[PDB]
Design a protein around this ligand. Structure first.
Ligand SMILES: CCCCCCCCCCCCCC(=O)O
Ligand SMILES: Nc1nc2ccc(F)cc2s1
Length: 130
């Protein structure tokens, strides 16, 4: 839709603080902090696939909107994820050990804007088409 494409990270704010709030150790934060991943979003019927590709780590999720799925995150959390579409925004929640984090993906002008929230920390990551 508005989301389908190959997207390249162009900016990131507060990502280290976000990872620290998730419990990510220093070595992994160091790897994440200057990563510039691509995000490849595709849809086939009911099923959305989001691939994240980077030099040191690739991940992939496929899901149906509103159907919970098990996910291993790039920092090796085992989470229960649910993604819905709300006013054009893809809203993902990950739940694990009584905690939660939200990742909201929205299309704004030329950009894919990703807002990641854990507790008091809000990180914003912007991608543009490859
Ligand atoms: C090897 C690098 C691993 C870095 C660990 C990052 C922690 C996972 C949080 C990812 C949030 C998704 C952000 C996005 O799609 O831009
Ligand atoms: N597969 C990958 N997912 C992420 C998420 C964040 C990041 F900084 C690097 C990577 S690599």
């Amino acid at each position: 839709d508005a989301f389908v494409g190959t997207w390249k990270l162009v900016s990131s704010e507060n990502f280290d603080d976000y990872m620290k709030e998730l419990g990510v150790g220093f070595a992994t934060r160091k790897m994440g902090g200057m990563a510039k991943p691509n995000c490849i979003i595709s849809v086939n019927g009911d099923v959305i696939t989001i691939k994240t590709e980077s030099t040191l780590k690739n991940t992939e999720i496929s899901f149906i909107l509103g159907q919970e799925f098990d996910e291993v995150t790039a920092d090796d959390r085992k989470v229960k994820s649910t993604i819905t579409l709300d006013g054009g925004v893809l809203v993902q929640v990950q739940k694990w050990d009584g905690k939660s984090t939200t990742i909201k993906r929205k299309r704004e002008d030329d950009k894919l804007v990703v807002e990641c929230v854990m507790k008091g920390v809000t990180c914003t990551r912007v991608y543009e088409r490859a």
